[PDB]
């Protein structure tokens, strides 16, 4: 899996939450929709790589937000194809998968199908989800676009979190709102129990997992503000700045490490990077 170009677009409004799993994260406001940020992020990546929307062979989307995705009151891959004009592109969605796991699966499928220009997008516009006020957990909003060239040689590993190996980390769940009565109500609630050792346990998982691969530079996700400057974190969208910093350093290979709060594991995938 070769990363041809990266596009990113985050809301400028940051919202701060207290608690062991809290932090300062980007948050979409009002009636803002995900496509308003996803589209320019994709166009940014296509321009950098000089790839026309008609040249896209495959589009795979990842988005947990249950609404505020497009104007029509729904998965992200298809409405993106419509506005891009990627009429030759195929579309599906990998729901609650991590980015690392999605890149591995897509790299295997796309290389086996002979595709050359694949678009993996990640986005959130979580107005329709109530944050976990007890633990402070919230999703970072924004959009990430990865224009890839599959190769089939990406390696992948799935590793446990750090901390006490006898400790059972309680995963994230998003229960349905059982009392949706009028427009504006949330569709679900974020539920990730307060676990003060979890942010460090995730970072310890990253370090242990990287041992299963050659010694490669990292691009990692940061879902929690604990120990971070100003408590600010961008979740999966942290990868954007790191990927561009790797391009400036003329790096040809990297290890991308994700955190999956649903399985409470860390997942890594090896990648190549274009200059």
């Amino acid at each position: 899996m070769l990363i041809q170009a990266v596009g990113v677009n985050l809301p400028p409004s940051y919202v701060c939450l207290e608690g062991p799993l809290g932090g300062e994260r980007p948050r979409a406001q009002g009636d803002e929709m995900l496509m308003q940020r996803l589209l320019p992020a994709v166009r940014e990546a296509l321009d950098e790589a000089a790839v026309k929307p008609e040249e896209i062979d495959l589009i795979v989307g990842l988005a947990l937000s249950p609404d505020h995705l497009i104007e029509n009151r729904p998965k992200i891959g298809h409405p993106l194809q419509k506005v891009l004009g990627a009429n030759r592109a195929h579309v599906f969605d990998l729901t609650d998968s991590s980015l690392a796991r999605a890149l591995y699966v897509v790299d295997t499928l796309a290389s086996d199908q002979g595709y050359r220009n694949v678009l993996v997008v990640r986005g959130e516009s979580s107005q329709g989800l109530e944050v976990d006020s007890e633990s402070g957990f919230a999703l970072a909003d924004g959009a990430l676009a990865l224009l890839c060239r599959p190769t089939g040689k990406a390696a992948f590993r799935r590793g446990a979190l750090g901390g006490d190996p006898a400790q059972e980390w309680l995963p994230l769940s998003i229960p349905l709102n059982t009392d949706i009565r009028q427009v504006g109500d949330v569709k679900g609630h974020l539920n990730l129990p307060a676990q003060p050792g979890l942010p460090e346990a995730v970072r310890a998982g990253f370090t242990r997992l990287a041992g299963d691969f050659p010694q490669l530079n990292w691009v990692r996700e940061e879902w929690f503000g604990q120990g971070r400057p100003d408590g600010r974190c961008l979740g999966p969208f942290e990868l954007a700045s790191q990927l561009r910093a790797a391009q400036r350093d003329r790096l040809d290979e990297l290890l991308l490490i994700s955190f999956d709060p649903f399985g409470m594991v860390v997942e890594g995938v090896t990648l190549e990077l274009a200059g």
Partner: protein, 309 residues
């Protein structure tokens, strides 16, 4: 590098069926005899959650039955790919016993722990009525490139709890689930010969034949070389148009929406199972499976012996 064997398949339908004149449709206006002929549905099944039927409980039954019948150790499963058209799931078994209606997580992570698939990579995909074909293709690529030896595929439709029974659309769709096992088959004859997808809400009869045509072209075969066909089940006249569009004769495919309804992503795997269990499809047959999402997909399969359980 490796050949892909479709080793086994099974389905699980709801215990209770509903006739076209069932009281549940009392509020549906403008129903006619032509309506039933048009869509080809005579009876349909809805999950009864009060009796423990949902998108999860019946998959566990089907998955446990398939693993037991195929003599597959749970720890030997390398990957679990699940699909469910409904954005709402309702049961997590013993893994998350207190969780009810939920948007996330999906099924794969919870299902693998319920079944003891300790080495299986979980994945949850969404491609609407084409989800079964997408999951078989993902599994095929993983097996082809030597990254997996056994892949468990699941499609589970629990849409009846979202139907508006004051609208005629509620008379078309139904609930159901399907589970299939794909394995490495280097020594055997079974393999995936080719697949294709095409693009052009969409009822145009030609878009599926185009995909079928490309798949046959990629495999270097013609319609005459195919023994049997398996289509999605949106309506009898569409399926017929697909068949004629590619040259398939009425004797080379089945219409199965009559007793199940349109089960979105499960109609295809259910139709495949029916043809196998009834003698329509036999070992060595080369078949084509085609359906639509807005996408259209087709796959050319060289089948060996498939375990129906």
């Amino acid at each position: 590098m490796h050949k892909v064997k479709l080793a086994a398949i099974t389905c699980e339908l709801p215990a209770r069926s509903y006739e076209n004149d069932d009281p549940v449709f009392a509020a549906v206006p403008d129903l006619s005899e032509s309506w039933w002929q048009f869509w080809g549905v005579n009876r349909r099944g809805y999950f009864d959650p009060r009796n423990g039927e949902n998108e999860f409980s019946l998959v566990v039954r089907a998955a446990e039955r398939l693993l037991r019948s195929s003599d597959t150790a749970p720890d030997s499963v390398d990957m679990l790919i699940c699909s469910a058209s409904s954005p709402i799931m309702t049961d997590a078994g013993d893994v998350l016993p207190d969780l009810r209606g939920r948007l996330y997580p999906r099924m794969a992570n919870v299902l693998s722990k319920q079944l003891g698939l300790s080495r299986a990579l979980p994945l949850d995909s969404q491609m609407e009525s084409a989800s079964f074909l997408l999951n078989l293709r993902l599994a095929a690529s993983m097996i082809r490139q030597g990254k997996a030896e056994k892949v468990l595929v699941v499609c589970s439709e629990y849409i009846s709890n979202l139907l508006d029974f004051t609208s005629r659309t509620s008379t078309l769709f139904a609930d159901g689930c399907a589970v299939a096992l794909l394995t490495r088959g280097d020594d055997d004859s079974c393999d995936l010969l080719a697949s294709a997808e095409h693009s052009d809400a969409s009822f145009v009869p030609t878009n599926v034949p185009i995909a079928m045509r490309r798949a046959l072209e990629k495999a270097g075969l013609g319609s005459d070389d195919i023994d049997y066909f398996v289509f999605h089940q949106p309506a009898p006249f569409l399926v017929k148009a697909w068949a004629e569009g590619i040259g398939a004769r009425p004797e080379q495919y089945q219409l199965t929406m009559g007793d199940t309804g349109v089960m979105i992503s499960v109609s295809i795997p259910y139709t495949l199972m029916t043809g196998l269990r009834e003698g329509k499809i036999r070992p060595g047959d080369r078949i084509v499976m085609a359906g639509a999402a807005w996408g259209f997909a087709a796959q050319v399969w060289q089948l060996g012996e498939v375990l129906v359980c």
